[PDB]
């Protein structure tokens, strides 16, 4: 039952020094080796220091750790902020084999320019019909700020059942993009006149409507 | 050097049997007195332990994950694998096979974590719909046009246009859960509107779970 | 508030903007090296633990 | 200039536009409350003495 108490967010500005404690509740820290791992997201982890005192040889000398057995925290002093040591830190023990990890300890620095929400819109295919189904894609794209609110709408007619959208999301040329889906039967598709999608964002109002043609 | 690869497939159904393998390359399992464990990692989690062995029959096993973990090392094709048993939708993380000599100290060589979220016992084909642009899909002298990745199970879709041809302004959106389970995407490209009806634009959607690969032509709109 | 230039009274509030040396520098009692106002800003933000 | 957060070592050069920080208070680099723009202009004049 020995488990690493380490903080879920710990942030600094960069150029500073920091420290990151991994606590032991019922083993003490000083029975086993610790080690730390800094881990980029979505990539493999990688040790950024073991045996508590000394380096891995390719590391900055900034990563030093130290032990302080009496209140059974483990410390890393972590000094010089840079860009990329924005990353999870975990903390390592053994107990009696029987590895334990840590908690979790990652840091983030707390940039888009504005933009105009072009959208387009397109009505259900043919072969989406033949499979008696219906979609109408509504797409939001290249805008900022990523916050807009999608609202179907049928023959003058609010559309809420099977809306469905996506958060805003960034793109290549630094802006967001967005969609929404209105799943719909075929038969409901015909039986209004139009319909429109309504994208309301920063208080102006892009529309755009499709009809069975 | 040396260097770790993971094999086996990235899904699993719920109450069945998982069949991960990591192979050893630059490198000899029984030489050095080497050990070989296991580390799971869940998308926004810590990473947790799951189990090391020796290349004898030696081995140790998370009590939270015991009676569960069955881990073989055959030296003749230098390699190790492990078959977890009874997988959950809890168990959902990114797996590391992890390359490790002091059995305190560290996992020195990390391999590649391989994506494996275990499925909701609902892996379908996906279906690929086209988004035929038109007049009212334009908004001054460029137009827009793509296909439609509905009802299909699990992640991920890879999506490409004209066999990666096509690259700028190509946009691929997150998917987002259905109303019943299912999952649906799209993805779009914005093209000046003069190369509408000269240029022929394919999108081909891929879905490596189900082995389906789908090739849908997309054209302007015919009014009927 | 993070600098003082010596303890302070208790129920007392201090809302001096003026030079506090860290050091000994004079720098006309406005600002320069080694001279600061106390101030100083949060780093507060709803996303935070 | 007249304004410096630190002492500078001999035979340098010291071009940094950033707002110097009369208080340690941040402002975003802008001129504000204890912060003060750490160049100013000379008042040069032919009819000077």
């Known amino acids: 039952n020995f488990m690493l108490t380490q903080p879920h967010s710990v942030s600094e500005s960069p150029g500073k020094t920091v420290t990151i404690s991994c606590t032991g509740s019922?083993?003490?820290?000083?029975?086993?080796?610790v080690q730390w791992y800094q881990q980029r997201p979505g990539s493999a982890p990688t040790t950024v220091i073991y045996?508590?005192?000394?380096?891995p040889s390719g590391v900055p000398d900034r990563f030093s750790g130290s032990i302080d057995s009496s209140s059974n925290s483990a410390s890393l002093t972590i000094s010089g902020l840079k860009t990329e040591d924005e990353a999870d830190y975990y903390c390592?023990?053994?107990?009696?084999?029987?590895?334990?990890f840590g908690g979790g300890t990652k840091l983030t620095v707390l940039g888009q320019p504005k933009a105009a929400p072009s959208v387009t819109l397109f009505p259900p295919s043919s072969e989406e019909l033949q499979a008696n189904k219906a979609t109408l894609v509504c797409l939001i794209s290249d805008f900022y700020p990523g916050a807009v609110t999608v609202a179907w709408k049928a023959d003058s007619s609010p559309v809420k059942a099977g809306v469905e959208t996506t958060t805003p999301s960034k793109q290549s040329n630094n802006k967001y993009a967005a969609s929404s889906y209105l799943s719909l039967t075929p038969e409901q598709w015909k039986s209004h006149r139009s319909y429109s999608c309504q994208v309301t964002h920063e208080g102006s109002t892009v529309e755009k409507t499709v009809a069975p043609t | 050097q040396v260097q770790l690869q993971e094999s086996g497939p990235g899904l699993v159904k719920p109450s069945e049997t998982l069949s991960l393998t990591c192979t050893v390359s630059?490198?000899?399992?029984?030489?050095?007195?080497?050990?070989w464990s296991w580390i799971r990692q869940p998308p926004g989690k810590g990473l947790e332990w799951i189990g090391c062995?020796?290349?004898?029959?030696?081995?140790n096993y998370n009590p939270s994950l015991k009676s569960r973990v069955t881990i073989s090392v055959d030296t003749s094709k230098d390699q190790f694998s492990l078959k977890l048993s009874s997988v959950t939708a809890a168990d959902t993380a990114v797996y590391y096979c992890?390359?490790?000599?002091?059995?305190?100290?560290?996992?020195?060589?990390w391999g590649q974590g391989t994506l494996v979220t275990v499925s909701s016992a609902s892996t379908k084909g996906p279906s690929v719909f086209p988004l035929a642009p038109s007049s009212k899909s334009t908004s001054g002298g460029t137009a827009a046009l793509g296909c439609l990745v509905k009802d299909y199970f699990p992640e991920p879709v890879t999506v490409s246009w004209n066999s990666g041809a096509l690259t700028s302004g190509v946009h691929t959106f997150p998917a987002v859960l259905q109303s019943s389970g299912l999952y649906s995407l799209s993805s779009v490209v914005t093209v000046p509107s003069s190369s509408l009806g000269t240029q022929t634009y394919i999108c081909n959607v891929n879905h490596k779970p189900s082995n389906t690969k789908v090739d849908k032509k997309v054209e302007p709109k015919s009014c009927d | 508030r993070l600098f003082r230039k010596s303890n302070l009274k208790p129920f007392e509030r201090d809302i001096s903007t003026e030079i506090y040396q860290a050091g000994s520098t004079p720098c006309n009692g406005v600002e320069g090296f080694n001279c600061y106002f106390p101030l100083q800003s949060y780093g507060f933000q709803p996303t935070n633990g | 200039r007249l304004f410096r957060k630190s002492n500078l070592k001999p035979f340098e050069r010291d071009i940094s536009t950033e707002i110097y920080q009369a208080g340690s208070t941040p402002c975003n680099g802008v001129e504000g409350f204890n912060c003060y723009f750490p160049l100013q202009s000379y008042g040069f004049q032919p009819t000077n003495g």
């Open positions: 630059g490198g000899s399992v029984s030489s050095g007195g080497y050990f």
């Open positions: 062995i020796y290349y004898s029959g030696s081995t």
């Open positions: 019922s083993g003490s820290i000083a029975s086993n080796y």
């Open positions: 992890a390359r490790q000599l002091w059995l305190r100290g560290r996992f020195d060589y």
């Open positions: 045996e508590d005192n000394q380096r």
């Open positions: 390592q023990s053994y107990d009696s084999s029987n590895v334990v």
